[PDB]
Amino acid sequence: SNASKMSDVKCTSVVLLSVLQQLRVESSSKLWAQCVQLHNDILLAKDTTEAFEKMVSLLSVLLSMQGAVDINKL
Amino acid sequence: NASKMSDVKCTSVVLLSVLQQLRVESSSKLWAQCVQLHNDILLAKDTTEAFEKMVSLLSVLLSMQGAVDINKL
Amino acid sequence: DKRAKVTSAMQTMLFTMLRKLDNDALNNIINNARDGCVPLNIIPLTTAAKLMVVIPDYNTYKNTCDGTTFTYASALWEIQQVVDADSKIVQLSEISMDNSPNLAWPLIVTALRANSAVKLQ
Amino acid sequence: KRAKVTSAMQTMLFTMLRKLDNDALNNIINNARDGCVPLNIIPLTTAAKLMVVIPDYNTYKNTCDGTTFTYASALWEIQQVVDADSKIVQLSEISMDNSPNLAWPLIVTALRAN
């Protein structure tokens, strides 16, 4: 049950990083390094609480990019 | 189903990232084939098509003896 | 543009996975983003750390703010400053149903993650 | 620390793969755990050619019967077998008593059946 979500949230973080990469965030050197570190922290998370809180930060990077993604997927 | 669809597509993104970390981009022809497989998985409309392409994509990783430990296998 | 089709499918799968996780904080910030309330810096996790958020309209202001408290990402945040779209300070008393058409939307709220434990230590 | 990240990403990959619970993926993962691994991309079309490493007799007998090779939820028609020295091996040679005399691993070439 909880181990199910653990792998699910880790899989999700890889997609999130890939979506951010496809949005040319790698050109923002400092921001991209912060995204990679958060993704790394999620993959290395010990419990679902820590993984979810780090995902909050990682996802907020995507959500700040208005017009890059649509509200129709939100 | 619709969740099985999202899980398989999520898995294929992870598989490609695992292969990228294993330097498969340095084989331009093979990397082009992996990307096309991943693309077709992400664009699939049914689970059967998505799983058949995943077999091909996964076989790239499994072909690389000494790149993934037997523990995870 | 196959790359664009794939990008669209990858983004749609991402939010399908996110909803399937059913985390209250993730749901909150996605649901806020759908209404135009989006963060401007990375959402921080340590107490007293600074968050800046866009508030697009009065309806969203009332749905997230009460007094000096902003509710977001399953946490409470103490509002320090509000500025309008020309970067001019806005007092909370100005944000009323009657006065909001007079304001330059969207507003930008700066707030600090609230802490409940031994506040005077 | 990139090795820890890389190891975590690969553990999660195979945990997700197992969660998909697909027979064909399960079959090739389990075969790979025993050392039976492909040498080209597994094809999906009738009569397409596949090459696999077969490490030992127990794996050979686990996957091969007559001239049929079972793999990735499909049947494959064995076309040719070679040993480590790239010398052709007849199926009649791959036997419990004679396998100690072969140069393992073998490489089996087969064509997908429809």
Residue numbers in the entry:
A (entry chain A): -2 to 71
B (entry chain C): -1 to 71
C (entry chain B): 78 to 198
D (entry chain D): 79 to 192
The publication says:
SARS-CoV-2 RdRp, also referred to as nonstructural protein 12 (Nsp12), is the catalytic center of the macromolecular complex frequently referred to as the replication transcription complex (RTC). In SARS-CoV-2, besides RdRp (Nsp12), the RTC involves nonstructural proteins Nsp7, Nsp8, and others.
The C-terminus of the Nsp8 is well defined in Nsp7/8B, but not in other forms. In all of our crystal forms, the heterodimer formed between Nsp7 and 8 places Nsp7 near the half β-barrel-like domain of Nsp8 with the N-terminal helix of Nsp8 extended and pointing away (approximate dimensions of 40 × 40 × 46 Å). The similarity between all heterodimers in all our crystal forms is remarkable, with a root mean square deviation of 0.82 Å for 184 aligned Cα atoms despite different unit cell dimensions, different space groups, and different asymmetric units. In contrast to previously reported Nsp7/8 structures from other coronaviruses, in all three of our structures, either as in the asymmetric content or symmetry related, a heterotetramer or a dimer of heterodimers is present as an elongated, thick rod shape of 40 × 92 Å. Comparing the heterotetramers in the asymmetric units, the RMSD is 1.28 Å for 368 aligned Cα atoms.
